[PDB]
Write a protein that binds this ligand. Sequence first.
Ligand SMILES: Cn1cc2c(CC(=O)N3CCC[C@H](C(N)=O)C3)cccc2n1
Ligand SMILES: [Zn+2]
Length: 139
Amino acid sequence: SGAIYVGNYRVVNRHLATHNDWANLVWEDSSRDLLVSSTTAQGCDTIARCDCQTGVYYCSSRRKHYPVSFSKPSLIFVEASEYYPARYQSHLMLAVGHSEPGDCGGILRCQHGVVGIVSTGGNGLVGFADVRDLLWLDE
Ligand SMILES: Cn1cc2c(CC(=O)N3CCC[C@H](C(N)=O)C3)cccc2n1
Ligand SMILES: [Zn+2]
């Protein structure tokens, strides 16, 4: 589990979105595994606005924060699941590292702030859904 809280928006994995996220939907994108919903309180997470390729991610399955080198966001093949069929998920970044399905929602961070959240995994490769391009989260 896990979310990003910035201004009056909440960012979660689209496959883990609640009924309340859907009732207060701002924007969702199946191909990115992203959903944004509105909040009453004002969040204060800082979004990175960079091209960093090193960061630190939180892994709930190990109660540890790990440093990783990740690829630039792109279209990558993600195996079928109970949430989506076999598809190409866009804006995805991979890193050599540990992850389990329940690790989705953990934040990836660089020196400049929040980069994105855990979204895919397997084969010892963790996939992060990027958020640095969503400039409207700050405005
Ligand atoms: C983070 N994580 C998810 C893992 C899975 C499952 C997985 O990747 N996905 C299932 C849920 C939806 C996902 C998507 N974005 O389409 C794909 C299996 C093993 C290890 C994992 N580490
Ligand atoms: Zn950065």
